[PDB]
Ligand SMILES: Nc1nc2c(ncn2[C@@H]2O[C@H](COP(=O)(O)OP(=O)(O)OP(=O)(O)O)[C@@H](O)[C@H]2O)c(=O)[nH]1
Ligand SMILES: O=P(O)(O)O[C@H]1[C@H](O)[C@@H](OP(=O)(O)O)[C@H](OP(=O)(O)O)[C@@H](OP(=O)(O)O)[C@H]1O
């Protein structure tokens with residue numbers, strides 16, 4: 001099996017940490033991504049070609065560049081960052097409403113669940129305005145990228161739902 | 164298409180260069196834009212999306228002599244000789260794919276512009292052990 005994945009989200013959400021936890025089986029100390037990282041990960045008979053694009057302000061107008069061919073979107077959110085959750089919501093909907101992204105299944109990593117008072121999956125579902133969207137295939141997976149909690153579960157969802 | 168040009172606003176340097184291909188060693192005239200630690204290149208100045216993107220992570224610059232093109236330099240990784248440089252380029256259908264380069268050989272139209280580009284690119288390299296860490300760990304388990 002094969003799946004092209006685009007992984008997006010605000011800067012500091014946990015995207016690169018997730019990528020290399022999956023690719024290298026270990027939590028690494030990251031630095032902000034100036035462009036992108038790309039890795040192919042084999043998981044339970046599916047090869048995921050994962051494009052992790054930098055989430056800094058200045059880079060976001062370039063996100064659209066990476067849409068073509070995307071079969072699954074992974075959108076990573078920092079669940080402890082209530083100051084920027086509405087910003088994350090705005091970005092997510094811009095992505096999924098794009099003509100090139102209409103067919104993509106949507107995995108949300110509700111990341112940093114280890115942190116005190118971090119938003120739970122049900123809160124993330126509300127705050128990202130996913131409840132309205134009833135014509136798309138989406139799922140909110142709680143995760144802690146640094147321990148690995150929830151990551152395999154997310155990849156399992158992608159395989160189960162990709163048609 | 165999409166106009167992505169806010170990405171390239173107020174760059175460090177821009178200009179026309181000739182560049183050598185990766186696997187297929189052909190020369191192409193490209194408009195380059197250096198900004199925010201990335202080297203972008205385009206087919207035409209009127210393009211609103213890049214042909215190629217080269218994140219400037221732990222790369223170095225060397226002057227080289229070329230038998231046919233003048234004012235040449237190469238982008239390369241000094242720590243991992245022979246290893247593919249991270250980059251992406253756009254295929255005919257618009258799909259972004261990984262680059263195949265172990266070096267980027269580039270020709271400038273004058274020695275002055277060569278010097279300008281080398282100085283600018285060197286100043287814009289993101290240097291950090293993180294990149295070497297990733298390459299080393301990846302290579303240890305690659306199958
Ligand atoms: N507490 C906690 N910190 C995390 C978790 N996941 C990632 N981080 C940390 O959050 C910071 C940013 O993580 P990155 O993976 O670099 O975030 P990013 O989305 O790649 O950011 P950009 O490269 O700018 O797009 C790092 O210091 C990570 O160690 C998590 O689950 N819990
Ligand atoms: O145009 P033709 O003669 O077919 O050869 C192409 C161009 O040189 C491409 O440059 P550009 O992308 O500027 O059009 C290059 O991609 P790079 O941009 O990665 O250098 C390709 O490298 P390989 O795909 O490595 O062969 C090469 O096959």
Ligand SMILES: [K+]
Nearest residue numbers: 065068257258
């Ligand atoms: K594209």
Ligand SMILES: [Mg+2]
Nearest residue numbers: 015016032033
């Ligand atoms: Mg990153």
